[PDB]
Amino acid sequence: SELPQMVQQLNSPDQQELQSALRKLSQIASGGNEQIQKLIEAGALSPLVKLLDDASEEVIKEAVWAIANIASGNNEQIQKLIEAGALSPLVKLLDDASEEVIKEAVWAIANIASGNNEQIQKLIEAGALSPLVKLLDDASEEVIKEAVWAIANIASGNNEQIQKLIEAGALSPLVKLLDDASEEVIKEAVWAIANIASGNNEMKQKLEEAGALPALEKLQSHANEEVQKNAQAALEAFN
């Protein structure tokens, strides 16, 4: 309702008033693309991004949650988020002290990567690939779950982007994730590998060298029917 005042309250020194504005803003950000558009028209994005460079970890956590929800908008809305300078503060956050902040920053990056190839290129230029690949082994299964999703979306980009992903060393941790304890992680890793398997013969050669083929074949004896099917589809996409 009173969006410009809430956007103004995003600059309030009073943290109670700020968090009150952040909660209202976040509820709008998760209300779909028409609601996200209202946040954009109210000039919410720049003040929102500015909060990623804040003293309070909780304010950062709340602002990234809202950014992740805005990043789930259409390609034009994702573009407005990039223009507001969201990429650099998000990439810096992949090395943050808080695991919950990392999870949300990876979630935001995964949503940005679900946009067009120009927006995937913007993530690559902001240097998202190296810290994302680094996160493919970082303790938390929930963090890995976010990181694989981001990488799978990046892997659906053009051949130059897939090559950039391979250069950042994505293949060895992805192949190891085909034998991860979590079934959801396996499915995600298969999706990422199937996207890499889609494209030119140079990328297919790289997957074969990484050991994706026996790892995909081992999944043909997995208890889950959907995992077997996706692994077979990934091997078909390779042949």
Binding site: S72, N111, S114, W149, A150, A152, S156, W191, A194
Partner: peptide, 8 residues
């Protein structure tokens, strides 16, 4: 090829 939003 497959792109997907991460939703909750």
């Amino acid at each position: 090829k497959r792109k997907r939003k991460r939703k909750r």
